[PDB]
């Protein structure tokens, strides 16, 4: 029954970067990166921060919520990854990422 991050669109004014989790467990926040290397760039964090550009379709403060879809210039282009983190200490841990979405 392993959790999956369903990034439905291979490719996508306010763009919408769609994410859906199949499970709540293991518990932990949903984060977005542009790209994936040691240089990847954070775009949203459910756990902490202020992201005036980014906005969420569903109330991520509800325990049972599985919709992690966000409503976010040519500088914006790139591959986006919805990453599910599992709780850790000192830091959370990449659990599963969706396959990626190319913003054009």
């Amino acid at each position, epitope marked *: 029954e392993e959790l999956q991050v369903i990034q439905p669109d291979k490719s996508v004014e306010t763009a919408t970067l769609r994410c859906t989790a199949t499970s709540l467990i*293991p518990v932990g926040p949903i984060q977005w990166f542009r790209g994936a290397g040691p240089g990847r760039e954070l775009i949203y964090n459910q756990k902490e921060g202020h992201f005036p550009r980014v906005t969420t379709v569903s109330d991520l403060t509800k325990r049972n919520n599985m919709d992690f879809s966000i409503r976010i210039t040519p500088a914006d282009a790139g591959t986006y990854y919805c990453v599910k983190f599992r709780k850790g200490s000192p830091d959370d*841990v990449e659990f599963k990422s969706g396959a990626g979405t190319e913003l054009s």
Partner: antibody
Amino acid sequence: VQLVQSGAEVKKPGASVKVSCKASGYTFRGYGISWVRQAPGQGLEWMGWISAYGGETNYAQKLQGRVTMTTDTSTSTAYMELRSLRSDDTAVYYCAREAGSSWYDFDLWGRGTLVTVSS
Amino acid sequence: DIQMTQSPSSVSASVGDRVTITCRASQGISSWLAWYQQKPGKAPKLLIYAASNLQSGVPSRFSGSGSGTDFTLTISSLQPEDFATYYCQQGASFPITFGGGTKVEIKR
């Protein structure tokens, strides 16, 4: 859906205690476990947290060095050891499922274990 | 360490009153604040999480508000079962911290 804790302990100062907590009725590894204690007539004091998935821990500063939390995934059991026991460790010790998505909270609680530390 | 401060420490009220209890965080914890109720001889119980979400089964008598540092738990139309101690708890970061507790007792 429950957490069932071991029985009351009576320890001498300088001794060690280990409290167990068996989970049933849910996927144990999905969640964290925290320990919270309450000395007689007092409030709640958080001791620490452990990931039941990967065993990462975080302990309250005050207890770092004397406390150890572990899990046994094979039996869905959480364990808390506390070492070099003093009088002021006397308290009821609770196990709680930590179940917040991207916050921490404790939605399922054990019934508590009394640990009495004295000469 | 984020210090949680609960006010008042005791509230006295009659069946039917509205009661309001407050918690102040020493710094911003977004809306990651939970409230518990404890009765004598019993483990605490989770009532409200993320400042204002009720846990399933908790009566609508209870509700919660706030963001950043200041938060409130309200109990509308108190019933004999609501007389207890209530704890807040910050859930933004380790170490997890609880407030000192607010006891709600019966005015007579």
